[PDB]
């Protein structure tokens, strides 16, 4: 879970390569030349260019930076905030209760520990 890929600036795009590639890790400091494969999910993130630019502006290039590694991304959820002061109110309440130390009955439809366990299960299946 790599926050603010933006702070990658121009160095990490290099990384995305192997990353998006084999997740091989190529290392030669000349101490050795060694490719370390990897497999790791990408939970990734960046800000839009000018704040929320995406509205008229095309996402591509409203996102900008990831160059081709951009093309390496399977999914994207664009987040923008327009108040339905209905909704605004809603989240507002939500938060508030949360902020109220108690009593939060925020409890997952499924128990979370139960979840992680289940997660173990789901991996087992091979569709």
């Amino acid at each position: 879970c790599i926050d603010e890929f933006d702070k990658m600036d121009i160095s990490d795009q290099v990384a995305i390569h192997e990353a998006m590639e084999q997740q091989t890790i190529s290392i030669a400091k000349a101490g050795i030349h060694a490719t370390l494969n990897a497999r790791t999910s990408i939970l990734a993130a960046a800000n839009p260019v000018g704040g929320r630019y995406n509205r008229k502006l095309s996402l591509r290039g409203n996102l900008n930076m990831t160059a081709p590694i951009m093309s390496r991304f399977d999914l994207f959820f664009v987040i923008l905030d327009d108040c339905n002061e209905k909704i605004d109110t809603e989240l507002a309440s939500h938060i508030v209760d949360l902020h109220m130390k108690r009593d939060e009955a925020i409890e997952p439809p499924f128990s979370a520990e139960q979840l992680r366990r289940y997660i173990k299960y789901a991996r087992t299946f091979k569709p």
Partner: protein, 376 residues
């Protein structure tokens, strides 16, 4: 109101572990700027004096490392020894930061971790770990002005990342209207002592506690656990609504902060009242905002305006060119020509670059800027 917001910073918030995690603590990070010699130093002095665990540091006398993990050679045993840098120490109490605006970019990268996490993860060197440092942040800054000067974007006039900016809990901005009529009074105060040369009767005659304060602080800390109940909720929302009408964190702040207020006065539950001033205090930097921004400037009429006109013209000279390319020159010419919002040929160059690179434009040459084809 400064002295006040601070006082709250002394009373700040309440820690919440949730079931696990939770852990918003009580933390409040106040920043303050203005014309220099504000005594802006003196305060940090005072707090540092008061603060048991606090530490006072200067911008640039610093970098992201000295706050943590010196891991120096012990050399007493001729050993290497992990030395908590400044921050880990400062866990608890507050931190006094000089010349925040001036900190090394490497430095304060630290901060975002602290501020957000409220803890710190050092994977570096021999031991990889996430250590918790929970401490309040008090930062001083000088506008570039150093008088931030009227108008301008203040948000500009402060420099800093508008995000990292936004991070600071309490944004205090100091300024001078030359109340005549103030300087007189201030000069009376100041001019005192004078007598007595041996320190005596500083603020007399006025009522103040001395050490009773320290204790009181201590006790209130120890024994108080305020809970706002429902009351706040409504108005509380309506506020931040008016605010975004700004960010959620603003709300969050409001929460923790007011919790300090009712922490003071020893309230285990909050009046819906005392939230008023709680808001008001935020409304102060706003009332200090009179006399996020980045985007605002950057939307047509700012950058959306910019590129919009840009493309517009490009389209025009295309049309009038029988679709042939617009020239760099003619571009710059009509674009400063229609004059008005002042499109500087450099800015021109930049936005042009943007659209082309956005493939919102397709053009080239050295002194030859041909036109575009926006496919996007």
């Amino acid at each position: 109101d400064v002295k006040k917001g601070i006082l709250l910073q002394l009373f700040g918030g309440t820690n919440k572990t949730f079931t696990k995690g939770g852990r918003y603590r009580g933390d409040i990070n106040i920043l303050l700027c203005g014309d220099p010699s504000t005594s802006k130093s003196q305060i940090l002095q005072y707090v540092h004096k008061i603060t048991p665990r606090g530490v006072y540091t200067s911008g640039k006398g610093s970098s992201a490392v000295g706050l943590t993990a010196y891991i120096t050679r012990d050399v007493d045993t001729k050993q290497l020894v992990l030395e908590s840098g400044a921050l880990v120490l400062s866990d608890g109490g507050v931190c006094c930061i000089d010349e925040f605006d001036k900190m090394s970019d490497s430095t304060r990268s630290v901060l975002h971790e602290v501020m957000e996490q409220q803890t710190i993860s050092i994977a570096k060197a021999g031991i990889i770990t996430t250590l918790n440092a929970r401490s309040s942040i008090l930062a001083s800054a000088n506008p570039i002005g150093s008088r931030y000067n009227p108008n301008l974007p203040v948000t500009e006039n402060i420099d800093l990342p508008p995000p990292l900016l936004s991070r600071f809990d309490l944004v205090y901005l100091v300024l001078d209207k030359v109340d005549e009529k103030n300087d007189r009074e201030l000069a009376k105060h100041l001019t005192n002592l004078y007598l007595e040369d041996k320190p005596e009767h500083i603020s007399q005659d006025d009522v103040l506690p001395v050490e009773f304060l320290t204790m009181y602080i201590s006790y209130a800390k120890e024994h108080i656990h305020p809970i706002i109940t429902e009351a706040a909720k409504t108005e509380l929302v309506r506020a931040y609504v008016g605010m975004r009408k700004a960010t959620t964190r603003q709300l969050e702040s409001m929460i923790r902060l007011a919790e300090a207020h009712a922490k003071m006065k020893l309230k285990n539950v909050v009046e819906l009242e005392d939230v008023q001033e709680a808001v008001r205090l935020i409304r102060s930097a706003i009332k200090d905002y009179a006399t996020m921004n980045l985007v605002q400037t950057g939307k047509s009429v700012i950058q959306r305006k910019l590129q919009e006109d840009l493309s517009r013209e490009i389209m025009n000279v295309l049309k009038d060119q029988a679709s042939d390319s617009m020239s760099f020159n003619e571009l710059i010419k009509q674009i400063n020509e229609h004059s008005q919002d002042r499109v500087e040929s450099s800015d021109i160059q930049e936005a042009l670059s943007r659209l082309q690179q956005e493939d919102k434009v397709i053009v080239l040459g050295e002194g030859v800027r041909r036109s575009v084809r926006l496919n996007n």
